[PDB]
Design an enzyme around this catalytic site. Structure first.
Site, short mmCIF file in Angstrom:
data_model
loop_
_atom_site.label_atom_id
_atom_site.label_comp_id
_atom_site.label_asym_id
_atom_site.label_seq_id
_atom_site.Cartn_x
_atom_site.Cartn_y
_atom_site.Cartn_z
N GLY A 14 -4.79 -1.69 -4.66
CA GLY A 14 -3.26 -2.12 -4.28
C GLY A 14 -2.78 -2.78 -3.37
O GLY A 14 -3.32 -1.62 -2.25
N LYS A 36 -4.48 6.10 0.49
CA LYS A 36 -3.03 4.93 0.83
C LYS A 36 -3.07 5.30 2.09
O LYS A 36 -2.79 6.28 3.12
CB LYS A 36 -1.81 5.98 -0.11
CG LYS A 36 -0.59 4.94 0.05
CD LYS A 36 0.35 6.13 -1.28
CE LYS A 36 1.95 5.45 -0.95
NZ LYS A 36 3.08 5.88 -1.95
N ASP A 121 11.56 7.25 -10.28
CA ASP A 121 10.49 5.75 -10.11
C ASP A 121 9.45 6.11 -11.09
O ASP A 121 8.05 5.23 -11.31
CB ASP A 121 10.19 5.42 -8.43
CG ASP A 121 9.91 3.69 -9.26
OD1 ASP A 121 10.94 3.16 -9.71
OD2 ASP A 121 8.85 3.13 -8.18
C1 LIG Z 1 -6.04 -1.64 -10.20
O1 LIG Z 1 -6.66 -0.84 -10.03
C2 LIG Z 1 -6.46 0.39 -9.72
C3 LIG Z 1 -4.93 0.45 -8.92
C4 LIG Z 1 -5.25 1.87 -8.19
O2 LIG Z 1 -3.32 1.95 -7.73
C5 LIG Z 1 -2.86 0.60 -7.12
C6 LIG Z 1 -6.08 2.40 -7.75
N1 LIG Z 1 -5.39 3.89 -7.30
C7 LIG Z 1 -5.89 5.26 -7.66
O3 LIG Z 1 -6.36 5.68 -8.90
N2 LIG Z 1 -5.58 6.06 -6.72
C8 LIG Z 1 -3.75 6.30 -6.72
C9 LIG Z 1 -2.81 5.20 -5.85
N3 LIG Z 1 -1.74 5.57 -5.45
C10 LIG Z 1 -1.06 6.50 -5.65
C11 LIG Z 1 -2.04 7.43 -6.30
N4 LIG Z 1 -3.73 7.71 -6.09
C12 LIG Z 1 -7.21 2.67 -8.94
C13 LIG Z 1 -7.50 1.48 -9.62
CL1 LIG Z 1 -8.62 1.43 -10.39
#
Ligand SMILES: COc1cc(OC)c(NC(=O)Nc2cnccn2)cc1Cl
Length: 271
Positions: A14, A36, A121
């Protein structure tokens, strides 16, 4: 063991305003974590709150590394992605799936509130799913401490996403933290069961919000929601935060305790 500290950034998961979320794979073990990347106090609070969290329905924090002015947050990888992508527009998802996700969301929020943390949020974009479709609350960038040394602090800061914010945030100078998170969970449940957001914001200027207070449940999105989960939404989406249902009482709700969902399909053979 040499090279165990090396992680390869293999794909963009993302991208937000604070930066980007990358998939990191360990060079030796091939363990997958999400990283991140924050190109920076705003992240110092996110790190501090993340160091406190340890729950099966909350995204795990493994550590952080600072490379100059860039912060690397090592967080749990949820291969199932976002709950947002499991919601079919104007349809939602099967009711037993939404109940299981809502149960897991409640365990996560009970835990957070229990240690005096408010997420502020909650929305399907921040509710991640692991390989087994287990819900995990993510992103503590807007989170804060609302209870410290058993003393509650009333909040006044404008935070969240307008379709999911509680109406007291737009009407009152101060408000309790816990009913705000309960409200957003209610909008999340609505989205999961109808595949649409009821209103742009919870204000009287929004016709959809006025119709809900006038109990016009023959209108969308309420028309798509069965009477048992709708009866729960009638108790969550209460304008007065003091009259609004609490999580201990959500756990006693008829639909919340209604058997609907079968366990994960396990391998079997006949004869
Ligand atoms: C759109 O696919 C995804 C999007 C994701 O995050 C935006 C993730 N991220 C994910 O699994 N980890 C994450 C993200 N933000 C905070 C804490 N942990 C996995 C996948 Cl598969």
């Amino acid at each position: 063991v040499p090279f165990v500290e090396d992680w390869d950034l293999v794909q963009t998961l993302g991208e937000g305003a604070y930066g980007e979320v990358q998939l990191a794979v360990n060079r030796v073990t091939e363990e997958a974590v999400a990283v991140k990347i924050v190109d920076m106090e705003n992240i110092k609070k996110e790190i501090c709150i993340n160091k406190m969290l340890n729950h099966e329905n909350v995204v795990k924090f493994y550590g952080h590394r600072r490379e100059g002015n860039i912060q690397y947050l090592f967080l749990e990888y949820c291969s199932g992605g976002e709950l947002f992508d499991r919601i079919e527009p104007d349809i939602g998802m099967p009711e037993p799936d939404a109940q299981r996700f809502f149960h897991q969301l409640m365990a996560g929020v009970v835990y957070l509130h229990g240690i005096g943390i408010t997420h502020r949020d909650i929305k399907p974009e921040n509710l991640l799913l692991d390989e087994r479709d287990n819900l995990k609350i993510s992103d503590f960038g807007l989170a804060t401490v609302f209870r410290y040394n058993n003393r509650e602090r009333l909040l006044n800061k404008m935070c969240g996403t307008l379709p999911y914010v509680a109406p007291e945030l737009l009407k009152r100078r101060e408000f309790h933290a816990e009913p705000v998170d309960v409200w957003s969970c209610g909008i999340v449940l609505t989205a999961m069961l109808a595949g649409e957001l009821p209103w742009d914001q919870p204000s009287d200027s929004c016709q959809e919000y006025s119709d809900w207070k006038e109990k016009k449940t023959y209108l969308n999105p309420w028309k798509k929601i069965d009477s048992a989960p709708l009866a729960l939404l009638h108790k969550i989406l209460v304008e007065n935060p003091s009259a609004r249902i609490t999580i201990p009482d959500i756990k006693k709700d008829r639909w919340y305790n209604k058997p609907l969902k079968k366990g994960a399909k396990r391998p079997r053979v006949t004869s």
